[model samples]
Target chain A: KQSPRERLLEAAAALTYRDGVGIGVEALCKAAGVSKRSMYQLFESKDELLAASLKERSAAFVAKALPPADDGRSPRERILYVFERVESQAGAPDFQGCRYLAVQIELKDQAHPASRVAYQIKADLMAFFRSEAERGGASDPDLLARQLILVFDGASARAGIGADNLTGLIVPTLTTLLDAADMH
Target chain B: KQSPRERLLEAAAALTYRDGVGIGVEALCKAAGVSKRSMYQLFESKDELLAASLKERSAAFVAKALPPADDGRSPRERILYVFERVESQAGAPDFQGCRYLAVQIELKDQAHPASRVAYQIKADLMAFFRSEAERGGASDPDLLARQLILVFDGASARAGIGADNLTGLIVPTLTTLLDAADMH
Candidate 1:
């Protein structure tokens, strides 16, 4: 069996992402299969638990979507590969879009710890895109990175609204943009 | 003073869009300056109120964003014009992305009336894009329309996450795609 912290993080990630942050502590503890008292002992409060859950999920997403640099693919290829990964996830039967984005939308308070974590994840993604775009030899790496991030986020939002055939639809645009940017 | 229905809808739109549909009817009624009894008399439940509010907001958004033709702009110009409108809203001080998209994310139950209305709004948008793309003389209007919608949605999602200068960033991509489609 998973430890309480592990179970709690897994359960919280699923519940909060599937539902929203409004999922109460009782339901969270119930889903985690741990008592409320134990949950409190593990984390200071529900917000703290939520922050940890978001951090865990965000790290997993980045690791999966943008793997280590030693994968042997060109930076240009890696850029498109990130979209392929996103398309796979968006096309999943149980996909609910980017949980970090969802949490950011739900928690409008930018100062909140969870909100800060969500924003940091987005910033990290943007930074990754910038680095990749530069390595790919883009004329304007910053612009290319921002545009690619836009496509990434746009696809996620569309999938959240039940869009399908996303990879086929979006990859071409990305290619056209990259070509224009001389990133080939 | 506006009628209770009007007041409720206006308040609901602001509150729900700023927050989420999970806002309680009591808070909604309070915001609208209507009594709970008047609220129930006007709508069956909070869900019903949300549906009405969303429908009204959706109509208003479509009308505003995709205004009637005959503004002396060609189909191609009109198509990009839609993106300009979206960028304006996204850049607003209090923008919270598309309220319909937000509602759809929150109320994942496809059978829900609110969900149905939100889906219908998106479908209507796609159709609008198709007609516009055709008028613009795209080699494949359907493809162009789908691509444009993806950009529109991508920018919205980016803006919701606090990305700025959206039109500056996205219009070039739209232009590139249009040129590729032979739309101009």
Candidate 2:
């Protein structure tokens, strides 16, 4: 049986992603099968609960969103692999874009605890791009990394809002940027 | 002096942009110096107020965000000009990305009346891009237009969230995309 703490964390992630940070305390406790009293015992506040939920899933999110370590792929292929995952996941009916980006945009206050966690997650993603860009001998690894992340955020958000299915969109766009940068 | 109805619209727009869609009716009325009864007379609910507020600004936003018609600039320049404005605006202290985009993302319900309004505004923006790409003789006007809007969305969101300053980022990325599409 999962501990109440673990269940609260899980519920926070699920409910917030489905609804939004606007989710109230009562609903969170109801979703987690934990009493409000118990939830309070585990977390300092709702902000803590949200930050914890995002932190708990950070590793798994990146693990899935990114490629396996040391795969026999070029830096360019490795880079493209990430968007390939984004394009695939966006097709799911329940897709709500990247949770981190949504959290930041919804919260609007960068100083919020959850916003800080989200900022860090995207920063890590940019770091990955920078590393790959350097390894692939990009003309300007930093610039290339910046462009890639911008595209990723844009593509995911666009698809999240039902604006684009991302079919025939992501790859060609990425190819244009990647090719222009001389990636790989 | 603005009437209660007009003041209500102004307050709803300003408050939502500064705070969020979560602003309650009481606070909105307080901000507008209007009674709840008066607000009810003017709007069906907060949803209508938000939709109306966005509708109120659509023309002005586009007028300022886009270049004057018949500027005699190349289509590519006109398209790039839109992003140039975004870069300039993102520098403001109160910038919170595109309000229409923020509304859609925050609402998370595409069917929300406000979302419908926001969606149409963006559709107008996309139409502008398509027209320019076609006039500029892009290789695939439709595809190029899609690429431009995605970048615009991504770039603004990135700048809005303090992720990038977009100084070197916007122009180069647009140049790459425009050049790749062979836009003159």
Candidate 3:
């Protein structure tokens, strides 16, 4: 809404999601309302533009999906809350699954600037699940956390690829794992 | 050990896997040891070349991963057999997760020729799961099939992106799903 900086970031997120990082400098700048020279001046590299866009997007997603830390709900309810949002978000027509998951798969290089951003955000979510798993008194919080993220990443990838809507699928799978974990 | 047809197909698989379809004609021909003239003559279009490569790769994967259709193993065992191979395959140093999953995610176009190929193969796997789910006595074979494929895709995506090795993760998650389905 303000600067070339903001417009470029916005363009990067929207264009990359719809068409992937293949959206080149000319197109991105055209959409961003900047010249290629200005675009280069603003962001040091095209990849950095993407990494910045993804960092902002991931933060917003967490805010959208995760329950408040002090909500006082049971850990099971808190966990269920995250998935309810996942189902709701996937309901949108333009929805692509987790942005970071796509970034990681597309980049493939573990050390790539964008891949590192994706990897760290994903690990952060796993840690969230782990803390929830422990708080809920699961016998094996670490394993439960891994299982939860597996389902999370799985649902996101399938839905992103037009595989599943994840309505009945996610909650049922999560319940079984939570129950098996004996989470209180 | 092959003709231009075989070599190009092989190059399509290998180069596309490592660098994606972004590997231009010049590089693809270099890897395949053919002239660009011969490549366009051999394959109708670059996209068609990818479709051909993915078809062969997917077929080889099914042969490698799926148990013999007539194997006397229980439906549950056969299903577990599939996941076992998924885990084993992910262990390779060069292992990338499901090839078609990456293809679909990267192309991001549902109607693209290669996407159609990927979508059909994925659906075939879901059908296999649905059949097996019913055979194993799942109360809801359709649901179980969806659940099974979700895990399969998720595991592949996570491993492909360096998020997981799929060692302790896949089997347990699957067991929980299988047990909840009341599969025999």
Candidate 4:
């Protein structure tokens, strides 16, 4: 018993996640089991519909993937959790990095409504990691967060290029950083 | 006295280096001062020409960039040299890592002659660094070489993403490895 808006959101998320943002409005409407007339009735245009759809999907993805708390784990474990999740997903057949990361790279220079939502999601993810590092007692949480984020992005790019043995590359580096922070 | 064949190779190398392997063969021939008929005569097709061009570029790039000797400098210096060349190129407007790296990414799945050449070139680059590490007296040259290559690739990907500041993220980890190797 979903509302038309909820159905539309679900449909757009599936389509965009699978085929990217280039898919047409008609295809989304078809996938949602809604008539084109009903879709236009709810939204003024395709752009408005897309913006709302992206916002919905971003909210859901962030809530599920990047919870704010580290669940009582050490700062090191929390940092390692991010890479573990990445490695798990990288094992999939058609794996890409964070959905938000994929969208950002795909629309790196475009000025579309979806891009705003994507940027906000990235900013929020960064802030969450930075604050978590600080709360977990990093000596310079900002530097540590920046380093981890770069490693995270590097892992994502490697995954995109079909390099599945990426976790081994990052784990040693992460261990070095954790040791340094602990010793200091 | 450059022959038409030499001119074509030089033109293709510059253009392909700048734009990956997708550049037009017509434009390549025009730039080389050779007619399309003569260009195809020199090489069976554009694909064969591209392989030759990239192979030639690979040789020149390594010759110009890598040091000739196992200079008495530490293994750290050699690794640092790789990072310096990679990092300095980040500021160039046309810079997009190594031309070979760009091609490796662009042609990852495609089975073209150029793709094979690009693959071999990258494998050779990895081998060169490993050999240098061994020459510099690394007890575990293979491990050291792999770690250094991760940093090299990490720097290249970050450069493409316009996160020039991110290159420093690997320095701390690199320093740790250098220290460990020195004690052995």
Candidate 5:
């Protein structure tokens, strides 16, 4: 049996992603199969709960997204790996969009802890991209990383809006960008 | 003086874009300088009001972004012009990202009328890009247009996330995509 905390976090992630962050606390509690008191026991407040959810989701995304160093993939292949992951995620039946992007849009307040968490995840992704670009031997790793990040985020947005054939549409653009960056 | 309908729409656009579509109807009515009854009198419901706001914004965007035929700019220049406009909007003081995107995220229902409007607007933009790509002599205008739309939406997403130098960061990537597309 899942712990209350585990169930709560999973519920929050699914509810928030499927129903936006503005969902009422009642709906969230009901979805988690926990009472309000149980929720409060696990979280200090709604914002705190949200913050925890965002962090959990971010960690989960990063773990699944980046390949292990010993995965034996080339840097270029690793860089493209991010896109391949994104393509599958976006193509998922229940995919809403990037949870972080949705949070940023919904919250619209940078100082909020949840918003800060979202920004940190994005910044971390960019840094990861930069490192991968360098390892891929791009002459201008920063430029290449930023470009790839754009495509990455853009694909998310496109899929969020229900665009079909995301991988087919985006892979060619990625190829052009990678080739231009001399990633081979 | 603008009619109540016009005033309501202008207010809805401003508030929805800044605060989000989730802004309360009371706040929306207050911002429009109209009473709740007056609001309902003009539109059947808040959703209707939102749909109108989206359509108005779309019309305004298309008007400003696309140059007239007699303006003598090449199709390629016109396409790039859309990016320039996006950069400026993204850098504006009150920038709050794409309202349509936010709506889709908030509603999370494709069949919603407002969502339909948003998708239609995006589709129209892509179609416009296709035409311009053709006129600009892209060998694969459809492909080129789709690629540019990704960059366009990506730039908007980046700017919304508070990337400080959106134009500076995006222009080079745009050039790369354009050159690859044979846009010159």
Candidate 6:
């Protein structure tokens, strides 16, 4: 019923998210219950499979975690909704703290399909935040959004290093920025 | 004349700062012009050499970059001074961001001797900021300084990642925190 391609993507996402890019191709094929030859038939290489897996997961994550426009909430509330999603997801036991970020760190300037996928994920996420800021009606929303993005990115790295209560550390700072924007 | 021990430390600093922890012991010894026998004679292994190197570099860095304050500048000025120093060093061609920070990241939960050294540097720096804030007669100086440290740490990481005009990006946020402190 299920396509080998879909199964391969699912298996790659599960293994790569947990163990990172270092998980070998054999593991992915075994996890998917596909022969290595079938995996090669679906994906040209391990990097291609990795890129596809990450892209699919990112699309799913954004769709679920960042709804376009929900009712009964202010624009600011919508923006903070994204932060709360990150907080909860990051706190989850199975969460390995941003597969894209982990791959980017490991790649670290190595140009490859995986690195490109990671870049795309980052750019899309930033764009999502920028759009949210505009809807939030902040003065110079683009700049404020960029600052918030910086805080979010910094918090992600801190979380990976065992920082607790990241949102608590950042929300007050966000409020301070908002107040500054109001006075100006 | 410098002793072989001092030479080893200097070589470790240069290599660690330049190439990260991947520098081999042979490369380190070659950089110091000391035989492996002399290198091992000075330190039991690479770990001891790295710890000694970072401790020495961190002490010199803290001393020169954030010298003990004697003047009546506000706590904000002192904090900003430290940022300016960090920004300047980060911008320099030879600069590689904070050596301690580089090691902390490169180690990343490995529980090494350099981790403790890095932690010590952060603790000492935070304490200095706390004391300076109290001396400035600010209410809730601890809170204010902790907020500033967040900005400071964020800036350092951004700089490490080759963010341009990092000081410009961070100073406004620092100013906002300082203004909030005044109001409090």
> Against the true structure, candidate 6 has what lDDT?
0.68
Identify the candidate with maximal lDDT: 2
TM-score (all chains, Cα) for each model: 0.94, 0.98, 0.95, 0.70, 0.94, 0.75
RMSD from true fold, candidate 3 = 1.6
> Worst ten-residue run, lDDT, model 3 chain A?
A56-65
Best by DockQ: 2
RMSD of each: 1.8, 0.9, 1.6, 5.5, 1.8, 4.6
lDDT of 5 by residue, A23-110 (tens): 7778888888899999998899777788898898777678887887789988778877888887888778888777787787777778
Candidate 4 off by > 4 Å: A1-70, A96-128, A162-164, B1-21, B26-35, B42-48, B110-112, B132-140, B166-170, B180-184
- Candidate models: Cα lDDT each: 0.81, 0.90, 0.86, 0.66, 0.80, 0.68
Q: What is candidate 6's lDDT per residue for A1-47, written digit by digit as tens?
A: 98889999998888766655657888888888899999887789988
Order candidates by lDDT, high to low.
Answer: 2, 3, 1, 5, 6, 4
Candidate DockQ scores, in order: 0.63, 0.82, 0.78, 0.19, 0.69, 0.24
Q: Give the per-residue lDDT of model 5 (tens digit) for B12-80.
A: 888777776778888987888888899998899888998988887787777887776678898777887
Winner of 1 and 4 under lDDT? 1
Query: Residue by residue across B44-64, what tens digits does model 2's lDDT show?
Result: 998999999999978998999
Interface RMSD of structure candidate 1 (Å): 1.7
Determine which window of 10 residues in candidate 2 chain B has minimal summed lDDT: B13-22
Docking class of 2: high
Query: Cα deviation of A10 in candidate 5 (Å)?
Result: 1.8
Which residue pairs show collisions in model 6?
none
DockQ-best of 1 and 4:
1
lDDT of 3 by residue, B26-105 (tens): 88888889998899888888889899888877877788778997889999899999999888878887877888888888
Cα lDDT tens digits, model 1, A1-184, are 6899999998888888887778899999999889999999999998889899888777667788796778998887888888888888877887888777777777766777887888898888989989988988999898888888887777887787685458567677788888888996
Task: Provide backbone clash counts, one per model.
Answer: 1, 0, 1, 0, 0, 0
Model 3 spans > 4 angstroms off: none
Q: Please report the candidate that would top TM-score against the real structure.
A: 2
Worst 10 residues of 1 chain A by lDDT: A161-170
| lDDT (Cα, tens digit) per residue for candidate 1, span B144-178 | 87888777777776687575458568678888888
Off by over 4 Å in 5: none
lDDT of 4 at B154: 53
